[PDB]
Structure formats: C-alpha cells, structure tokens
Design a binder for this molecule. Structure first.
Ligand SMILES: [Fe+3]
Ligand SMILES: [Fe+3]
Ligand SMILES: [Fe+3]
Ligand SMILES: [Fe+3]
Ligand SMILES: [Fe+3]
Ligand SMILES: [Fe+3]
Lengths: 169, 169, 169, 169
C-alpha cells in the first residue's frame, strides 16, 4: 500500500481514473467546438473564445483529479481519449445544446462517482467532489441553459451575430 | 553593376518592379472603396475607416518593395497605376468580396514572384517575401473571408449597419 | 473550395491533421510524465513542473496547427489521441531520455511535413513550419540532451535530488 | 440544556473532547521533535523550524475544536496530555516517518469522529470536520510521504544535510 493510503478504496481509485478520461474527453470536445467556430465559413469569434476557455476549464478538471489521485495514494492509469462524436457543430444554438448535453453527462458521472465515495465511507472524497466539482457543474449547466434560451430568442442571422458580441464577452 | 549587387538577377529585379505597380494598384482600389463608403448615400464609417487603413497598408507594401529594390542594387522603374475597375462598390458584402478577390490576386502574383526567386537561387529574396508578405497575405485573406461570412449572416439593412459598428472597430 | 483556399493542397491539409494528433499525443505523454513525478513514491517537484510546462507547450503546438488549418481554408479532422506507451517513467534520467526520443520523433514528423509542403510548392507553409516549429524543436532537443548529460553526471540519489532543485527552476 | 444546543448529541460532544486531547498530544510530539533537532549533536535547523510550525498547527487544531465545542453548546473537559512516546527521534528520516504515522492516527480518529456525527445526523458538524480538518490531513499526509521519499533518495550524511536546506524552507 502506498504511504498515504488511508480510507481509500480500490473502487474509488478506479472511479477517479474513469472520470479523468471523461474530463479529458470534454476538454477535447470543447477544443473541437472552438476551432469549428474559427472556420472561415462559420467565423464567430465569441463562440471561439468561449469554447476555448471551456476547454481549458475541463483540462484543469482532469488535472485536479490527477493531483487528487496522487494525494490519496492511488495510481493514475490513462486511456485513449476518444475523438469527439461530431466534426461539425451546426449553429451556435446547436453547439450550445451539444454542450448542455455534454455537461449533464459529466455531472451524472460525477454524481455516480460521489455514490461510490459515499458507500465506501470516503468522507474526504465526497467533500472534495462537492466543493470542487458539483457546485461548478450546477453553475455551468444553468449558464448554458440561459444561453440556449437567448439563442432561441434572437434567432438565426443577425440574432446569432449579436449574441456572439453581447452575451459572450 | 551597382555596388551592392550580388546574387540578384535581372528577372528578379523586373519582377519586383511589376509587383510595385500591383501594390500601388491595390492601394488605389482600397482608397476608392474607402471614399465610396463615405458617400452620403452609402455612409458606412466603419467601412470607410477599414478600407483607408487597408489602403495605407498597400502603400507600405509598395514602398517596402521599392526600398528592397534599392537594397539589392536594382533600379526602380515606375509605371502608370491604372484606375480601379469600378467606380462604385455595391453593398458592404460586394466590397468585401471584391477585396477578397483583390487580395488573392496579389497573393498569386507574390507566389509567382517567389517562384522567380527560387529558380534563380535568391535565398535572401525568398525569405524576404515569406517573412514580410506571404504571412500577411494569408492572415488578410482569412480575415476578409470571416467578414464575408458575417456579412452574409447579418443580411442587408440593420445587419449591415450592425456589422459596420461591431466587426470594424 | 473554401473562400481563402489558395496554393493549399489536399495532401498538405491531411499532413497538418496528422501532425495535430501527434502534438496532442506529445502533450498527453508530458502530462503523464508530470503527474508521475508527483507520485508520493517519486516526489520530484522540479520534474513535475518541468513536464507540466512541456505539456502546455505541446497543447499550444497542436492549437497553432488547428488555427493554421483554418487560416489556409483546410478542415480540421480530429482522431483519438492514444494513451502514452508507459504508465511509469523510471528515474529522472529515464524520463528525460524518453522525452528526447519523443521530441526527435515529433521533429522527424515535422521535417516530413515540410517535405510535403516543399514538393507542393507551399512557400508560406514551409516558412510557417520553419519559423514556428523547426527552430523550437532544435532548441528543445539541445536542452533535453544537456539535461540527460547532467543527469548522468550527478548519478542517482542525492544527484537526482540536486538536479531537480538546480537545473529545473 | 445550554442556550445554543440544537441537534448536538452527548456522544458528539464527548468525541470532540477526546479529539481535543489528541490534537494537544500531536502538538506536544511535534514540539519534542523540534527541539530534538535543535540539539547540538543533531543540529538540523530546517527540521527544527518545520516541526515547530507543525506544532503550532496542531495547537490551532485543538483550539478550533475548543471553540467549536463552545459554539454548539457543549462543555470542554480537558485531560492530561501524555508525554510523547520517545525522547529522541533518530534521523530526519525516522522523525519524518514517526510524523507520518502520527498524522495517520489523527486522521483515523477524525474519520471515526465523522462517523459519530453522521450516525447522529449532525449535518453541520460533518461539514465542519470535512472543510476544516479532513482536507488538511490529506494534504499533510501527502506532503510528509513526499518528504520520506526524498529523505530515502538523498541518503544519510550530506543528503540529509542538503534536504534540510532545500526541502524545508
Ligand atoms: Fe464545464
Ligand atoms: Fe460537505
Ligand atoms: Fe492586403
Ligand atoms: Fe524561410
Ligand atoms: Fe517539445
Ligand atoms: Fe498535521
């Protein structure tokens, strides 16, 4: 057993390694999204910047889980990060809805990972998940929902152009 | 032979003199475009400013080639700069598309001028073209393409007015 | 053909997409390396920081290629990024030698990608590769070689500990 | 019942009083360790400073539990704080390993105290323990493990001397 390991179960360790891969996958999706909106036939610089920032956030999420794995005495096992499931992301509305669905899937995986910690009695891990992940997911999912509502409100064309300027920095 | 001349062929020298005239011609077109959008029945001050800045850029391009001609020991031979091929430039979309076509023609002339340098073994001239012209053309052509996409996105009327305010300074 | 596309061949476009995946793969390897040295039974914070910075550099390399693909009018096609070929990276000397081998493989892929640009006459792309990638690879490969020499000089134990403090920030 | 008492069980109150004594005991051990390394025949000033700071931390831990006991309406009952179980702490490696074992014992007592809060439904007390104690224990246990690894890496003699200078302030 590694020196720090205490109240840290193998199932919790394995759950963290699957979550690392999922956060890396989300980071990859957002990176794809960002450079899609940098296409010359898409050309929405607010969307480009917004998904780039979201991509860096997911990379931070993954690395924080890596750091935590080490803190508790687990061992990081990396896997292929799959390519995103689309090459092209439609309109700003489509991308924002794909992003909502993505964040809700990450949130469910996090809640399932909380359930592993809870049944194993990992008090510290539950609070770590709560403080550093669950609250952020809830804020993010609310923010993206608002954006979807406004992208429906403004419509295509000028509306989408104006949303890019006024709702995304 | 002039004092500095070394590894500098007469065909390269002549190519630079044709390119000088082309850059001057581009400068003239952009100047025409700029004051077209300053017409009282057009009246788009973002477009006016944007094409004025682009005109000064092309003037700089020409003068840099003049300076280089002298650096290598060639002799500048100037020609008439023809009047632009339109007096009137349509909508903001039309002007932006005329500008894309213009920049692509300058880029092709630059690539052909690179080919002259390459076959003559003008190592320094190729790098000069690469560093000081080819990269800028690629950035510019990408920027103008983005603008064309957004001018189609926003449509005529209010859209064109909003693009003038939000995409051009 | 996309609006900006000019002197940009399909083989060059495909080469950039393979290089994107390779830079992402290098970023993943360095990220693995970094958190390996953050293990409690490895615990070298200079190595951790050094490979984290190297990981961010490779991510920048990938994104710059993504941006360039868009600049020229190509289309980004992403693939799975494979997991690194080791879970554990040995001593500081082993990791530094794995890193040298990695950078030399990236450098060879870049030189092969230069060869594609050259035979297709992509003057701008060659200079882009030269200025923004080839020079950095040469500096990096020299830096890592120096580190390997010093890690052999200092030996294991105290030597490796001292190198972590004095050669890596 | 005291004025503030609400959802605060007698078993939870008693658990806090045992934890107070344990934190005081840890503070005493670290104080012993610190002045051991201030011995003229030991003379490691980094270790001296490090364990002094750790001693003050444990004193803060105890006093925070005292303050909390009062916040909830419990009553502090103090006991003898036993003398540490060694007068002499060996090498820097020995002391660091004794410290790891100490922190893991405090962590287990904290987790057992969390279990008392959980079964009694003391929602606020669990979060207090999580936020103010469990996270710190996990960081500390990871830090001490790293130090043990490096103290094995550097070896005795010059290694131990260098660790005192470079890993402890
Ligand atoms: Fe997110
Ligand atoms: Fe909590
Ligand atoms: Fe231009
Ligand atoms: Fe060059
Ligand atoms: Fe590198
Ligand atoms: Fe402690």
């Amino acid at each position: 057993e590694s020196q720090p390991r205490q109240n840290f179960k193998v199932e919790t360790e394995a759950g963290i390694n699957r979550q690392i891969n999922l956060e890396l996958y989300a980071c990859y999706c957002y990176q794809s999204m960002s450079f899609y909106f940098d296409r010359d036939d898409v050309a929405l610089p607010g969307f480009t910047k917004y998904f780039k920032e979201k991509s860096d956030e997911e990379r931070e999420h993954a690395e924080k889980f890596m750091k935590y794995q080490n803190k508790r005495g687990g061992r990081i096992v990396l896997q292929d990060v799959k390519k995103p499931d689309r090459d092209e992301w439609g309109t700003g509305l489509d991308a924002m809805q794909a992003s909502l669905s993505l964040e809700k899937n990450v949130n469910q995986a996090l809640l399932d990972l909380h359930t592993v910690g809870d049944k194993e009695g990992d008090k510290q891990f539950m609070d770590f998940l709560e403080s550093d992940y669950l609250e952020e997911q809830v804020e993010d999912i609310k923010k993206i929902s608002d954006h979807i509502t406004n992208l429906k409100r403004v419509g295509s064309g000028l509306g989408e152009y104006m949303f890019d300027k006024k709702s995304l920095d």
